[PDB]
């Protein structure tokens, strides 16, 4: 029983974190095989941040401008290339701690664990969701760049996020491991603002199914709804519209609980018009949206 | 900026998790040097667990009954003994991934990370607080026994918790690494209920500081109070008393933010009576009591753990 926001064990990723220094800039790098991945803005200087010409600054660089440190062992950069917004440094030793891994681009609503790192030393691990506006509500201090977000599946580590910047609103923006940003953001110090955020409706429904599995009983109702009537109400509360794809994803949870998806949608609808009247669901008095339908199945009973 | 529930990087502990099997019972073990630690209830049958004599159950068992699985390599038990509610299995090989470690016992309100495992395979990590009633609000499914709770200081892993059982109310109970239970529980199949829990007050104030550091400042008032006046109100609302030691611990947060604790207690005092009036603090609609003052300083000052 119980229900906690749970992160993945971070050991496989801890063995890959290194320190990348270029000039005075020091951030974290992800060391897989004989390549260290890190945000390309590490080659920028105080002046080259508002409008950096990264191709010009990199063709500009020699391998011995980069200092890579795995613990007290300085790796030797033997080559450096750029792929979109990630820098790739070839090093002369493959990381013997490299796990089975792949690079995956995730979609808004998907969750992942983030290993916060400073000077290449892991500091803590937590759970995140890719917001519908392509930001993440992280916990990051200066020097956290290069920290990665991941999932683990049968000792295979899917890397799906690398941290680059903090936006004015306090949220954070990053890329996948191929250097493509999530969202309309760029690795520049120019004026940048994220879209208005919305609640991941499919995740809340999943969480509500998790409450019933754990026996929570107070929010459901005798009502059902049409997909369009629900979406009409939800959008008026800054909730993401729900598509038939989402309804399909919830299928297994609905099957396990004997509560149809559109029945539960009617329960979310009522919850949005009444509130929760002092009560809580799985210990929360707000609706949680950082549990996917996959997560709910993994952590909950059967 | 930002603020999250954060656990210690679990890697040092992951290299110590093994699967222990006794008969049909199978749970997790902690492999440190040439000893494997796990709950003693593994030697129990579905009826001996109702009322056992762990003494006699143990001595009757032999070494080859304990299947100690380290991933897939099998470990050879060359001895076994008890220490309170934790069983100890001596194996022929010392764990080469053994971290710099010690066994500590924590107080209520102190936090730790938990590495939930199943069949010796680490599955997820999360951050707990020992509740005042000596339970922890965990997320465990069957197979989780032997999952361990720890803290990391520099390169030292401090093991402080081992999971044993879930209570009928859903919360969880276990021992320190020396077998001593946390709270008034026994490792037996009987009717056991959790005592009435309370709010870790010093952790709520520490969380309010984290909110201020993140610029969430609406709850700050203008008033100040006294420990007496606060604690009189706090007892009514099932809040833990705030001691003089608690105030000194909030010292650095106080000086970093310009908000003297007791001034902060006035804010928490108001929040306790008037509620939050449809507002939120760090996005949460409840007062968060699972962040210690050191937790807050650690997370807002970037301290790493190698
Ligand atoms: C508060 N916060 C939360 N996450 C972040 C991420 N982040 C960061 O870690 N560092 C940044 N600037 C640097 C300055 C340096 C000074 N020295 C000596 N070394 C430095 C290294 C960095 Cl990496 N930034 C700012 C930033 C980073 C970018 F990648 C970008 F495109 C624009 C930016 F304004 C930062 O956001 N900070
Ligand atoms: C859902 N949940 C989450 N945490 C818990 C605690 N807990 C547990 O995890 N396992 C238990 N019995 C086992 C049966 C097994 C059958 N096989 C094949 N392997 C098994 C392993 C275990 Cl560990 N129990 C029961 C239990 C064990 C005790 F030590 C005790 F004092 C009281 C109890 F009710 C359990 O509570 N469940």
Swiss-Prot record, chain A:
It catalyses: TSAVLQ-|-SGFRK-NH2 and SGVTFQ-|-GKFKK the two peptides corresponding to the two self-cleavage sites of the SARS 3C-like proteinase are the two most reactive peptide substrates. The enzyme exhibits a strong preference for substrates containing Gln at P1 position and Leu at P2 position. Inhibited by pyridone-containing alpha-ketoamides compounds 13a and 13b. In turn, alpha-ketoamide 13b (tert-butyl (1-((S)-1-(((S)-4-(benzylamino)-3,4-dioxo-1-((S)-2-oxopyrrolidin-3-yl)butan-2-yl)amino)-3-cyclopropyl-1-oxopropan-2-yl)-2-oxo-1,2-dihydropyridin-3-yl)carbamate) inhibits SARS-CoV-2 replication in human lung cells. Inhibited ex vivo by michael acceptor inhibitor N3. Inhibited ex vivo by compound 11a and 11b. The active site is at residues 41, 145. Changing residue 189 to A: Does not affect ability to cleave and inactivate human TRMT1. Residues 1-302 form the Peptidase C30 domain. Residues 1-302 are cytoplasmic. Changing residue 145 to A: Complete loss of 3C-like proteinase nsp5 cleavage. There is a cross-link at residues 5, 90 (Glycyl lysine isopeptide (Lys-Gly) (interchain with G-Cter in ubiquitin)). It is found in: Host cytoplasm; Host Golgi apparatus; Host nucleus. Changing residue 90 to R: In strain: Beta/B.1.351. Cleaves the C-terminus of replicase polyprotein at 11 sites. Recognizes substrates containing the core sequence [ILMVF]-Q-|-[SGACN]. Cleaves and inactivates human TRMT1, preventing tRNA guanine(26)-dimethylation of tRNAs. May cleave human NLRP1 in lung epithelial cells, thereby activating the NLRP1 inflammasome pathway. May cleave human GSDMD, triggering alternative GSDME-mediated epithelial cell death upon activation of the NLRP1 inflammasome, which may enhance the release interleukins 1B, 6, 16 and 18. Also able to bind an ADP-ribose-1''-phosphate (ADRP). 3CL-PRO exists as monomer and homodimer. Only the homodimer shows catalytic activity. Interacts with host FBXO22; this interaction promotes the proteasomal degradation of nsp5. This is 3C-like proteinase nsp5. It comes from Severe acute respiratory syndrome coronavirus 2. The gene is rep.
UniProtKB/Swiss-Prot annotation, chain B:
Residues 1-306 form the Peptidase C30 domain. Changing residue 189 to A: Does not affect ability to cleave and inactivate human TRMT1. Cleaves the C-terminus of replicase polyprotein at 11 sites. Recognizes substrates containing the core sequence [ILMVF]-Q-|-[SGACN]. Cleaves and inactivates human TRMT1, preventing tRNA guanine(26)-dimethylation of tRNAs. May cleave human NLRP1 in lung epithelial cells, thereby activating the NLRP1 inflammasome pathway. May cleave human GSDMD, triggering alternative GSDME-mediated epithelial cell death upon activation of the NLRP1 inflammasome, which may enhance the release interleukins 1B, 6, 16 and 18. Also able to bind an ADP-ribose-1''-phosphate (ADRP). The lineage of its organism: Viruses, Riboviria, Orthornavirae, Pisuviricota, Pisoniviricetes. Residues 1-306 are cytoplasmic. It comes from Severe acute respiratory syndrome coronavirus 2 (2019-nCoV). It catalyses: TSAVLQ-|-SGFRK-NH2 and SGVTFQ-|-GKFKK the two peptides corresponding to the two self-cleavage sites of the SARS 3C-like proteinase are the two most reactive peptide substrates. The enzyme exhibits a strong preference for substrates containing Gln at P1 position and Leu at P2 position. 3CL-PRO exists as monomer and homodimer. Only the homodimer shows catalytic activity. Interacts with host FBXO22; this interaction promotes the proteasomal degradation of nsp5. Inhibited by pyridone-containing alpha-ketoamides compounds 13a and 13b. In turn, alpha-ketoamide 13b (tert-butyl (1-((S)-1-(((S)-4-(benzylamino)-3,4-dioxo-1-((S)-2-oxopyrrolidin-3-yl)butan-2-yl)amino)-3-cyclopropyl-1-oxopropan-2-yl)-2-oxo-1,2-dihydropyridin-3-yl)carbamate) inhibits SARS-CoV-2 replication in human lung cells. Inhibited ex vivo by michael acceptor inhibitor N3. Inhibited ex vivo by compound 11a and 11b. The gene is rep. There is a cross-link at residues 5, 90 (Glycyl lysine isopeptide (Lys-Gly) (interchain with G-Cter in ubiquitin)). It comes from the Viruses. This is 3C-like proteinase nsp5. The active site is at 41 (for 3cl-pro activity), 145 (nucleophile). It is found in: Host cytoplasm; Host Golgi apparatus; Host nucleus.
């Amino acid at each position: 029983s119980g229900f906690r926001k749970m992160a993945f064990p971070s050991g496989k990723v801890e063995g890959c974190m290194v320190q990348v220094t270029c000039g005075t800039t020091t951030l974290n790098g992800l060391w897989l095989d004989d390549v260290v991945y890190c945000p390309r803005h590490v080659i920028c200087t105080s002046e080259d941040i508002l409008n950096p010409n990264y191709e010009d600054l990199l063709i500009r660089k020699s391998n011995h401008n980069f200092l890579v440190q795995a613990g007290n062992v300085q790796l030797r950069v033997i080559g450096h290339s750029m792929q979109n917004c990630v820098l790739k440094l070839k090093v002369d030793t493959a990381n013997p701690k490299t796990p089975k891994y792949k690079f995956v681009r995730i979609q808004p609503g998907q969750t992942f664990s983030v290993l916060a790192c400073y000077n290449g030393s892991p500091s803590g691990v937590y759970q995140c969701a890719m917001r519908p506006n392509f930001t993440i509500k992280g916990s990051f201090l200066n020097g956290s760049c290069g920290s990665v977000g991941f999932n683990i599946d049968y000792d295979c580590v899917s890397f799906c996020y690398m941290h680059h910047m903090e936006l004015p609103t306090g949220v954070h923006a990053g890329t996948d491991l191929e250097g493509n940003f999530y969202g309309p953001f760029v690795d520049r110090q120019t004026a940048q603002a994220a879209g208005t955020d919305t609640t991941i409706t499919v995740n809340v429904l999943a969480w509500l199914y998790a409450a019933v599995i754990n026996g929570d009983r107070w929010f459901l109702n005798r009502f059902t709804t049409t997909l369009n009537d629900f979406n009409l109400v939800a959008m008026k509360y800054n909730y993401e519209p729900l598509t038939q794809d989402h309804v399909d994803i919830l299928g297994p949870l609905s099957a396990q609980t004997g509560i149809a998806v559109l029945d539960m949608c009617a329960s979310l609808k009522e919850l949005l018009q009444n509130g929760m009247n002092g009560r809580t669901i799985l210990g929360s008095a707000l609706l949680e949206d950082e549990f996917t339908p996959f997560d709910v199945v993994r952590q909950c009973s059967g």
